[PDB]
Amino acid sequence: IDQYAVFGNPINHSKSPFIHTLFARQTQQSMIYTAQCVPVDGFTEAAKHFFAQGGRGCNVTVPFKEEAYRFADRLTERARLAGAVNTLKKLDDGEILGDNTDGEGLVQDLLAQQVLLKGATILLIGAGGAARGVLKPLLDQQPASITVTNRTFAKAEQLAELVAAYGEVKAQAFEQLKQSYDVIINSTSASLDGELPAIDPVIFSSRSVCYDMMYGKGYTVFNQWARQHGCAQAIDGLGMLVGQAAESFMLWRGLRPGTKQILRELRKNLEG
Amino acid sequence: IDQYAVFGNPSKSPFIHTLFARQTQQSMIYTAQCVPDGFTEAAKHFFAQGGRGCNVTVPFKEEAYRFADRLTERARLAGAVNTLKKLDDGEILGDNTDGEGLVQDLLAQQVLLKGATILLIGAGGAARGVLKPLLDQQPASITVTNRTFAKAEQLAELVAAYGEVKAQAFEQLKQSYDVIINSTSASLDGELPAIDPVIFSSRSVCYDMMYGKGYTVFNQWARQHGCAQAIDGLGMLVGQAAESFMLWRGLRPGTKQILRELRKNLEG
Numbered sequence A: 001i002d003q004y005a006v007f008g009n010p011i012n013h014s015k016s017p018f019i020h021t022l023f024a025r026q027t028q029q030s031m032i033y034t035a036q037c038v039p040v041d042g043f044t045e046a047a048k049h050f051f052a053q054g055g056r057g058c059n060v061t062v063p064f065k066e067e068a069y070r071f072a073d074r075l076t077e078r079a080r081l082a083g084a085v086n087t088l089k090k091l092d093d094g095e096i097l098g099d100n101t102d103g104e105g106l107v108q109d110l111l112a113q114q115v116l117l118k119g120a121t122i123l124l125i126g127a128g129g130a131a132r133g134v135l136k137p138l139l140d141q142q143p144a145s146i147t148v149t150n151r152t153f154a155k156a157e158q159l160a161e162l163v164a165a166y167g168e169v170k171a172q173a174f175e176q177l178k179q180s181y182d183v184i185i186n187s188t189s190a191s192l193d194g195e196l197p198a199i200d201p202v203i204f205s206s207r208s209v210c211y212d213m214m215y216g217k218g219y220t221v222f223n224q225w226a227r228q229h230g231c232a233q234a235i236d237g238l239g240m241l242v243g244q245a246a247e248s249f250m251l252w253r254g255l256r257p258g259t260k261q262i263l264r265e266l267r268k269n270l271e272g
Numbered sequence B: 001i002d003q004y005a006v007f008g009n010p011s012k013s014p015f016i017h018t019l020f021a022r023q024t025q026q027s028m029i030y031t032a033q034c035v036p037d038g039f040t041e042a043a044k045h046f047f048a049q050g051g052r053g054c055n056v057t058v059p060f061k062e063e064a065y066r067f068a069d070r071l072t073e074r075a076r077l078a079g080a081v082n083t084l085k086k087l088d089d090g091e092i093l094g095d096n097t098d099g100e101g102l103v104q105d106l107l108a109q110q111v112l113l114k115g116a117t118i119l120l121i122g123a124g125g126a127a128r129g130v131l132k133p134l135l136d137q138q139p140a141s142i143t144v145t146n147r148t149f150a151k152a153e154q155l156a157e158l159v160a161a162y163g164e165v166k167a168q169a170f171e172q173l174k175q176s177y178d179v180i181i182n183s184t185s186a187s188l189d190g191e192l193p194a195i196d197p198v199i200f201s202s203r204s205v206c207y208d209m210m211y212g213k214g215y216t217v218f219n220q221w222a223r224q225h226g227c228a229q230a231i232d233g234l235g236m237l238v239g240q241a242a243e244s245f246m247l248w249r250g251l252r253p254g255t256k257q258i259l260r261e262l263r264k265n266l267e268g
């Protein structure tokens, strides 16, 4: 029985165990997955011992994604550009492969919502770690372009440079934005009372698809705002979560499981 | 879904309980939580959010003992708690399953404890936690020995009323026993307790709370004097886990399957 787990601190709000337990039951795999809380500076050592007792792979959440990045012998290209790792896997030869499934998780979620990125104009709001981790996979879907935006133009351009070798990626400050986009993806954080960054509503259109990485009961404040100006379809990041997990499950084992059932289940509990 | 966990500073419990979960088709999740502040705080919060029970690793077993609203006979005697359970009335029950795990492992290995002569090497927390359960099996006698005699004598007088129990220093041990149980740490430092191997006989059953790949240091030593059967503590670990699982779910899970899986992980 292969062992898998999720290392982080804290782990109280981790859906991974619940998620991967259901995938294993749907695809009947001889595996176990558990949540292991680890001391702020004990990930490296905690990780070493894990692969010793028969650990085949594991997810890494805050705040060990960067430390895991260094811990991995070889990193996938998507992980290299991401600068962080959320999925480790001990290969057959012995070494440990680092990877990041954020991007693909987003892409597979979009496809599930019947959103095609082929030849589309994409607007990525924000340029932090979340935004960084989704670029490459978005580009691979071959869109017309991807525009990265932040309040400060500086941080937006740097990010666009890093992935310039995979597609058409532009950068612009929020005050510059003056056109609509086919698909808007928000990676920024909003306050608990619903205050969003100062972005001109020109970005939205009647045919625009809006995807917000945040999720919760009903619609997110960002999606509600998109709908006030025309948004044709609003989606939250709950699918992305189930997606990225699904991608890790595929990586270790070799079969992508059905999220439909799981995503639905996670949402009922979320709405409860 | 019912939430369970294990609190500790550094475990196999999550793996172990998750398998019991599968086997018994129990809708529950078992996680490994960090211990900041203190256990008491983490614990209050844990049950305050819906947790139904948890395991406690060293050195929080004594603090878990105080955290419990009501203790079980075996927990009170052991002086420590490795298992906490929230009852239907909101009260938190504290119990200690280490001794029952040892006993069941021994019985599973076809070892007769009733009317047997036993030598318990050590007088720390591990020894104290297994005395009551051993005494309930009605052995002819239990000899508590420890490097520092005083502590062995104090432990023997503490449970004198529950059965035939006497203490002796290592130097005094000059006779063989039916069952020899090693509860000391000596092995961690790669050392053996200063005891004359005469204690081992060809009929002797040696049980070491320690476990690992191959035979333990203490058991290799027992084998150097023709013991009848040398056993490690892996069965104790799986056994204490199972008792806690029964305490929380009302059903008892199978230990063979799990014990064999863990054994495979140890052997490379």
Ligand SMILES: NC(=O)C1=CN([C@@H]2O[C@H](COP(=O)(O)OP(=O)(O)OC[C@H]3O[C@@H](n4cnc5c(N)ncnc54)[C@H](OP(=O)(O)O)[C@@H]3O)[C@@H](O)[C@H]2O)C=CC1
Pocket (backbone or CB within 6 Å): B122, B123, B124, B125, B126, B127, B146, B147, B148, B149, B151, B182, B183, B184, B185, B186, B187, B189, B191, B192, B193, B194, B209, B210, B211
């Ligand atoms: N395998 C593993 O990784 C794990 C194993 N365990 C088990 O749990 C138990 C926890 O120990 P616990 O009893 O609570 O610890 P304590 O410190 O409370 O007691 C240890 C006892 O062992 C005796 N002892 C220790 N070292 C020596 C030595 N070199 N020579 C002779 N006697 C010695 C001590 O005698 P004195 O009173 O004279 O000092 C003491 O009575 C251990 O026995 C261990 O087997 C626990 C966690 C991990």
